[PDB]
Amino acid sequence: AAQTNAPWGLARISSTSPGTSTYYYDESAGQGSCVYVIDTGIEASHPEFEGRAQMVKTYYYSSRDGNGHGTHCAGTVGSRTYGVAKKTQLFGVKVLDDNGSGQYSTIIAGMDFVASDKNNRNCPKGVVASLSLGGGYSSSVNSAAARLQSSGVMVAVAAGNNNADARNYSPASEPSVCTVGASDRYDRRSSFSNYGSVLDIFGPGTSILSTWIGGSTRSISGTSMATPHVAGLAAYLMTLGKTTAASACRYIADTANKGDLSNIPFGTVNLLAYNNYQA
Questions:
Q1: Which residues are Ca(2+) 1-binding?
Q2: Could you give the CA distance from residue 206 to residue 119 in angstroms, rounded to a whole number?
Q3: What is the sign of the dihedral through the CA atoms of 7, 12, 17 and 23?
Q4: From 53, 60, 81, 100, which residue has the greatest number of CB atoms within 10 Å?
Q5: How far is CA 96 from CA 105, 135, 245, 248, 270, in A?
Q6: Which CATH entry fits the domain spanning 2-272: 3.40.50.200, 3.40.50.880, 1.10.1160.10, 3.40.630.30?
Q7: Is there a catalytic annotation at residue 184?
Q8: H or E element at residue 200
Q9: Binding residues for Ca(2+)
Q10: Catalytic entry in 15, 65, 69, 79
């Protein structure tokens, strides 16, 4: 399948080269997989989700995305125009209030929720969790992410937007999940992107166009926008049978574009997510 005039990030993940604008992907498109977007909620009614998105859990007075951040990440995972896996199922877990903030205990509870809730969902191709969130180091947030990964969900988390070593952030520093940095359309490390030995992969993170609340769209930046590219890619690769939840991050890193990124600090992986689809 070929999506002409795709967002640069989608075109990048199916390209050996920057600077193209067509997204190439196998039509299976994540069919039969599930991605949990653990964030501010998802505006499920957005026409870009085609009835494939729904809220399954909130810890606040509403499950509605009053922020837009969770809707935007969900759109990068699986919306028809802006998504990596255009046929996956999107399950919203609202752990962040409409200010974008949330207590670690609520975030931990949401990860444990996903690790149990997947047994209530039909995900024969497998389960992914996209965690475009984080804060300071927390061994209990790390362990919650490790438990979610251990239960058979591929966990993709943002490295963080501090232009620092991700070692001091959670769940970015949990080694067993998949920590995602951000790159820009010129294959530069995003100026804000965290780095370090704990990073596993980079995805498009600068000026990412996706869905927004009120049925709209907008372009915003963050390692938080690189994560749903990797989450979506995983669900795409799992649907294709090329990897499992336990080995998806390792597979994505094995098959990534090597050494194409600039301003990658010494000791950080120079790997850019790549679906390696041959049309």
A1: 175, 177, 200
A2: 35
A3: negative
A4: 53
A5: 11, 12, 25, 26, 31
A6: 3.40.50.200
A7: no
A8: none
A9: 16, 175, 177, 200, 260
A10: 69
